[PDB]
């Protein structure tokens, strides 16, 4: 399924700190953020997505249209400018963020009642699993 609508509560997080270090997030922020359970809220209608990543420590929101390139400031993550594009590879939703960092972006897909996420930067991959609330 390509339908990723829902409120998604984190059940597994792997190598989150490696991904953050690859983005040059400072020590203090990394040490707090790695501890935390995350929530992902996805509103999806056709190509139009609104995504919100949250914890007790951050709120990171982005809106995009599948297949439409958009310029992006990564705001409270690593404050960088990137050229972003989200597309489908089968039923994997793939984001490529072109800029200073190589291999930067993410992939999301549904397995049953769970959402699987890869966050990539450089040679680091963070793997996450969320359960549909
Ligand atoms: C599709 C998933 C996305 C866009 C994200 C998943 C985790 C994100 C995120 C955003 C900000 C932060 N930080 C602020 C200090 C740490 C961590 C993770 S976005």
Swiss-Prot record:
Tissue spec. comment: Higher expression in adult small intestine and to a much lesser extent in fetal kidney.
Keywords of the record: Cytoplasm, Retinol-binding, Transport, Vitamin A
CDD domains, alphabetized: CRBP2 (cd19463)
Entry GO MF terms: fatty acid binding; molecular carrier activity; retinal binding; retinoid binding; retinol binding
InterPro entries assigned to the protein according to its UniProt record, in alphabetical order: Calycin, Fatty_acid-bd, ILBP, Lipocln_cytosolic_FA-bd_dom
Keyword Transmembrane in record: no
Any Gene Ontology CC annotation: cytosol
GO biological process terms, semicolon-separated: epidermis development; fatty acid transport; vitamin A metabolic process
Record's subcellular location: Cytoplasm
Binding-site residues, all-trans-retinol: 40, 108
Pfam family, one: Lipocalin
Key word Cytoplasm present: yes
Domain notes per entry: Forms a beta-barrel structure that accommodates hydrophobic ligands in its interior.
Function: Intracellular transport of retinol.
Family the entry assigns: Belongs to the calycin superfamily. Fatty-acid binding protein (FABP) family.
UniProt name for this protein: Retinol-binding protein 2
Source organism per UniProt: Homo sapiens
